[PDB]
Amino acid sequence: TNQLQYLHKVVMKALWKHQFAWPFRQPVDAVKLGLPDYHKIIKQPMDMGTIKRRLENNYYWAASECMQDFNTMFTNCYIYNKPTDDIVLMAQTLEKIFLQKVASMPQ
Amino acid sequence: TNQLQYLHKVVMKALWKHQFAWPFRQPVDAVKLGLPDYHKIIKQPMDMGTIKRRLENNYYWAASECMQDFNTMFTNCYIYNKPTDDIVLMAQTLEKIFLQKVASMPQE
């Protein structure tokens, strides 16, 4: 539907290109980053890559579904990371833009 | 606006009465909770009590403004607390509702 298309073509597109998007565009690599607790704390990993793919394979049945995955991705980052780490700020920024654009979503 | 009238009447009506709302209805009280570092970590405390009041006094110029306060209240909670605290789960459960509701907000 129109909403999933807006989330694809408008919202995801804007976040994807953002100067802070690079760490979010594929799943967290726990080994490559030296985060061996990661999968013990974050039991539902999400990333914009997985979300984009799902938006391409028509995985979602409603907008809120897709919205939830955005939220888990952010929530996850805020839960695992220290408050002082830049990655947290990076998510706050992206998260704010997601909300901004969701207000302008159709229906 | 249409959008803000949706947040007050649909969104906040549903969140304010939820069995998990209670820790969120008024500002985090660092003294009462024995959290001396709370204000050192969270710089923009937010709560539904504040948001409801703002909805009631038409403080917000646009819908998205309100949404960011709801966001900050949640983000605050996730950043301050331990991953395993119940308070997180409670925030998580309100936030799902918030987001589900926000998907059905009009557009003007």
Ligand SMILES: CCS(=O)(=O)Nc1ccc(Oc2ccc(F)cc2F)c(-c2cn(C)c(=O)c3[nH]ccc23)c1
């Ligand atoms: C495709 C992602 S990747 O995994 O393949 N690469 C990758 C690269 C850098 C990353 O973060 C950094 C950011 C800014 C710096 F200055 C240094 C960093 F290391 C993260 C990262 C992501 N996320 C969600 C976190 O929560 C998190 N916590 C700790 C690291 C991370 C992931």
Ligand SMILES: CCS(=O)(=O)Nc1ccc(Oc2ccc(F)cc2F)c(-c2cn(C)c(=O)c3[nH]ccc23)c1
């Ligand atoms: C109404 C504001 S209040 O401050 O006056 N009362 C109050 C009472 C209980 C609370 O949490 C609990 C919930 C359920 C339990 F079983 C035990 C708890 F402690 C919190 C609370 C809120 N928030 C946002 C937090 O981030 C947080 N972190 C640590 C506590 C909290 C605030």
